[PDB]
Design an enzyme around this catalytic site. Structure first.
Site, PDB file in Angstrom:
ATOM      1  N   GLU A  11      -5.798  -5.318  -0.202  1.00 28.05           N
ATOM      2  CA  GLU A  11      -5.605  -4.548  -1.421  1.00 28.05           C
ATOM      3  C   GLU A  11      -5.535  -3.029  -1.270  1.00 28.05           C
ATOM      4  OE1 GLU A  11      -4.681  -5.549  -4.416  1.00 28.05           O
ATOM      5  OE2 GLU A  11      -5.228  -7.699  -4.500  1.00 28.05           O
ATOM      6  N   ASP A  20       0.965  -1.280  -9.050  1.00 32.70           N
ATOM      7  CA  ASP A  20       1.289  -2.336  -8.153  1.00 32.70           C
ATOM      8  C   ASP A  20       2.718  -2.835  -8.185  1.00 32.70           C
ATOM      9  OD1 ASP A  20       1.429  -3.627 -10.506  1.00 32.70           O
ATOM     10  OD2 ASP A  20      -0.164  -5.054  -9.990  1.00 32.70           O
TER      11      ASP A  20
END
Length: 173
Positions: A11, A20
């Site tokens: 992540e 994202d």
């Protein structure tokens, strides 16, 4: 290696609100904030969103930050998130059992999926789950790969898959 380190790698870490690959406003270690809008939107839109994401953040942290946080803060969010993922799993009638049958390493992989795609999303992999439960390592990996997830985030999916396939952390070495 463990869940934290694992997801830490997958992540990343960011102290400033970013977005994202799936067009979501996020921060820290994959901490979701708000669904992003399409560029075809203008100030009204965009800013509204930035605004909103911003509020989410403030709310989460309990303070005004102007879209920026500290490492300590992120790590906090992070823990909370791992915790949550781990609760969805236990609260889920379909995940609980798979989870329980798994060795510690593989458990880790499931948590990752959950954390990345939500308990709802994960419970959707019925065939793969069953396979995992029967410990049909390679079949599952094949099944798993035939997905949006894989196709969208292949490198990451790869590590996870391998993890499921080997019960080891090699992929992360």
């Amino acid at each position: 290696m463990n869940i934290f380190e694992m997801l830490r790698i997958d992540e990343g870490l960011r102290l400033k609100i970013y977005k994202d690959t799936e067009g979501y406003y996020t921060i820290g270690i994959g901490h979701l904030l708000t669904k992003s809008p399409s560029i075809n939107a203008a100030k009204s839109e965009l800013d509204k969103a930035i605004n909103a994401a911003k509020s989410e953040l403030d709310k989460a942290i309990g303070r005004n930050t102007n879209g920026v946080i500290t490492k300590d803060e992120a790590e906090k969010l992070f823990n909370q998130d791992v915790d949550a993922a781990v609760r969805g799993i236990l609260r889920n009638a379909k995940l609980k059992p798979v989870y329980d049958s798994l060795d510690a390493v593989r458990r880790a992989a499931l948590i990752n999926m959950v954390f990345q795609m939500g308990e709802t999303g994960v419970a959707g992999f019925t065939n793969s789950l069953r396979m995992l439960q029967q410990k049909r390592w390679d079949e599952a990996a094949v099944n798993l790969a035939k997905s949006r997830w894989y196709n969208q985030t292949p490198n990451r999916a790869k590590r996870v898959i391998t993890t499921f396939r080997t019960g080891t952390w090699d992929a992360y070495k």
